[PDB]
Design a protein around this ligand. Structure first.
Ligand SMILES: C[As](C)(=O)[O-]
Ligand SMILES: C[As](C)(=O)[O-]
Ligand SMILES: C[As](C)(=O)[O-]
Ligand SMILES: [Cl-]
Ligand SMILES: [Cl-]
Ligand code: NI
Ligand code: NI
Ligand code: NI
Ligand code: NI
Ligand code: NI
Ligand code: NI
Lengths: 378, 378, 378
């Protein structure tokens, strides 16, 4: 049987280079041809595109910036930043999450070796910039986030959210549900913390989004799957709510003891039972603190990177995913963007899994996307 | 007599707000109107422009990104990054100078209080991104730098260069000189180090730019003015060239003892005697090391910030400036972008002085700008 | 069966103390006897040797500095720094790799518990300092590196290279091949990235060493083994070359799925099939990013430290090793020398494996070392 590396060499031969050539040609047109001493004539004078990695304006993966967000429906994937840390109960700083993730994402090429995916060749990706968050008023910021996510989601572009603390899980899912009609969404929640209590410090903070998300008809608590719960920061009020609403929880010990495949099976079966799509909400602190120091609620004994990445491989490829957020990256507490890099890897792997499973590019808008907004979902 | 504060309050009333309103209107068009709960209806859903400062894609001061650099002649000022550290003889890292400067420049408004300047109302500014530098070949990187700066300069846009180590002083000035025809450029060089030796570690490094710049006819060494020379890092080979070529040098003690006004008088008279424009090359390490830890060659006993900024006030307002570079910011060695912030202040102050002295916007392209490039200037 | 701890207790009794005593006597002669209040009369007034760990001039493991590099043939092992980061395509700073490794290596004793090796008793080790690298000209720096490694290698001393970015893989191996005559060297390459493309940013950078090494007759691509390839930074151009030249690749998943012993078996069989010795090129970024933040190309999902160290145990002990380099340690991005410490552990473990397997000390110069330099190998 062939090794993963042998398949990767074969898969790479199947990838085109038209996307790369178009980047080269645009670069030479917009950035001039290189000086006479440069041998490689694909190089421009001015950096325009991927190279050099240390150079250029820092959109996510140096994807095109989409200034006119009304055109977002023309893209397969829209990276959207949510610079929001008004829901943080310990360290703030994740309002800079989007910046840190964009910054370190310059390290990446659009090509994933193991999967034989090249995003520059296989999807159209844009970076729409950031939601205009409201730091002094969590609820107004919620309303901004929901309006923007509902905009991107209803356009048909697949939304990838750069958080931002996890309180945004309520307004993002609320934005989705405004266009779900009567369809239901299962939430697959990677986290050490249940995030299901009603209020915290008298407000709807990052410990609270799934209390309020699953108050919506379109988001059944019975379809909330919570992978990695454990430690000394799981609030007892949230635990009570999980028990009363019958959410589906696995601890890190559960996951490693039952095997990753059985853990993903559990999540796939529970999240899709009676729903039409799945929302992926990935808290970067579900990874062991030694890998993600740049976060508000680090906890030892979390998932190791390859464990979380393998769970995503199983779950993304075998569910109908309608969107994703990666939350709680807090650059001011990071070292050399280690934590932003972990988040970037989750984001890019997810896109690659959507491509491998044929979910992107979409050949038509999904059945669950309703055009008219249901402004009273919450 | 009126205080600077009293004058500042009056100067502000003279500034328009059409540039601000135009930004607001573009923002609402491209970024949608805000959600219903937001009272201030100049706020969009998606950040598009200055606000929020912590959000958005990080161009310089969040200025417009000019993807098509062939259109650069339509702007009064073009910010261009030169992510180049193949000339560093101690610490590398200033290839990230442009990124660090861009990142912390989100902190600034276009408005300077003391000077009554608002760059959003009074000039057109763009960020053209970065030169495609060549880390493994300093001379090829020179050729890229010269071609790109010559493009911007000859278009009529005023170039501001984000370094990048100071070796780029040779190719930047070489790019200007390709279009100076029979005109001369005086160099006003803020630095602890003379940067005038022939080679270092067998190449034309950041200790060498003015040896090779002043080999060109268009850039007389007798018009090189070097402000702040001193310390334990001034190489004896460079000192020999300064003496043999009769450059104009003031130490920090010279400057503080003769007074800042006399120091600027000295610089203005020597740089312009027989020249038609002046090039400002500002090494961030001319500031005392305690203010600029993010640099390759820190040195105690440098200029204090208000001293360097006052010199710029005098020199920029009273010379015909053709461009500026701010070099040697090295973010990997910085703390909370302290050094990038110092560089940003120099950049923005310079723009404001160009506006106060009526050098920008230009009512016509300057006499010294020739259309045809003289590829044999060096 | 006896536990590893029990064997370690027995192995320690087999180690001599002549090397320790000689250090003590030199220290007292050169550093004076201690003040009268010091009970332990093996302590000098001036630190001379291992102790104290926090004190002293920072050679590697506080080994002797060999000022006269012409005498290197008298030592079993020569540590040589290659402070070269002109091949870096994202973050620079690994020109300080040798300094970072030297600094944190003060923490180590010459003695390894599990293996019962004491390098102070069983080999002669020197630190010859650094190659005079050329930051502004990658190719000149290559020529310096090749000349120096060729000097050490042909002397009979076992070369251990402290990088320095991985572009040095070409000039280091080229230096070896200048003295291999008609013998072949298999390359065992620990890395997430293939490093096999022809040029990058128009030059022979750290993505390119094995394209050019395996152009040499003495270094067959068919004997290149690449352990750990994967992620989003493997360039498609390099993947092409691996496929066309039939290099031998295992991904991280391959390695963990087939077992470490089977992966080492695979590496041993492929690298030694038709070669006379093996070159170890260890990119520190093959370790998961959470352990090596101080590097230019971190990538999540890499090898865990005990996995990489066990592979080295199997590979070093069962191949005829002619030298080793550990590359891409970049101290400016490190935290408390965590990454330099990992590199030091790889280096010291390797020496212990060479001693355990009887490869060091050498009782005679190896058959593959030819005295005359073959300056046209490339
Ligand atoms: C949003 As949380 C309380 O899991 O850091
Ligand atoms: C460019 As310098 C030698 O003054 O840091
Ligand atoms: C030498 As590399 C491109 O694997 O850091
Ligand atoms: Cl940034
Ligand atoms: Cl040190
Ligand atoms: Ni959470
Ligand atoms: Ni959490
Ligand atoms: Ni200087
Ligand atoms: Ni300088
Ligand atoms: Ni690597
Ligand atoms: Ni490598």
């Amino acid at each position: 049987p062939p090794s993963e590396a042998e398949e990767a060499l074969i898969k790479e031969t199947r990838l085109p280079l038209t996307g790369w050539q178009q980047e080269v040609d645009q670069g030479l047109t917009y950035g001039l041809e290189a000086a006479a001493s440069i041998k490689d004539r694909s190089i421009p004078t001015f950096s325009r595109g991927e190279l050099p990695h240390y150079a250029g304006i820092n959109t996510f993966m140096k994807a095109p910036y989409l200034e006119d967000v009304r055109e977002v429906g023309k893209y397969d994937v829209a990276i959207v930043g949510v610079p929001h840390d008004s829901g943080t109960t310990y360290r703030p700083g994740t309002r800079f999450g989007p910046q840190g993730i964009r910054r370190i994402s310059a390290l990446y090429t659009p090509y994933n070796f193991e999967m034989g995916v090249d995003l520059r060749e296989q999807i159209s990706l844009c970076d729409v910039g950031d939601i205009f968050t409201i730091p002094a008023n969590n609820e107004k910021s919620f309303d901004q986030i929901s309006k923007g996510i509902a905009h991107i989601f209803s356009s048909g572009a697949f939304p990838i959210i750069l958080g931002g603390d996890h309180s945004i899980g309520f307004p993002t899912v609320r934005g989705i549900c405004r266009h779900l009609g009567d369809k239901k969404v299962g939430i697959i929640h990677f986290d050490r913390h249940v995030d299901t209590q009603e209020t915290d410090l008298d407000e709807r903070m990052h410990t609270c989004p799934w209390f309020h998300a699953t108050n919506m008809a379109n988001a059944p608590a019975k379809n909330l799957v919570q992978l990695g719960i454990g430690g000394w920061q799981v609030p007892r009020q949230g635990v009570k709510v999980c028990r009363e609403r019958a959410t589906n929880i696995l601890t890190v010990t559960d996951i490693t003891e039952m095997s990753l495949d059985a853990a993903a099976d559990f999540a796939i079966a529970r999240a899709t039972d009676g729903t039409d799509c799945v929302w992926i909400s990935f808290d970067i602190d579900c990874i062991d603190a030694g890998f993600v120091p740049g976060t508000g609620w680090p906890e030892p004994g979390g998932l190791l990177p390859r464990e979380a990445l393998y769970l995503l491989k199983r779950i993304i490829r075998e569910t109908n995913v309608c969107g994703m957020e990666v939350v709680e990256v807090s650059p001011p507490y990071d070292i050399s963007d280690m934590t932003s890099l972990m988040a970037t890897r989750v984001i890019c792997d997810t896109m690659a899994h959507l491509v491998v499973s044929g979910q992107l590019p979409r050949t038509e808008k999904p059945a669950y996307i309703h055009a008219e907004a249901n402004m009273a979902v919450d």
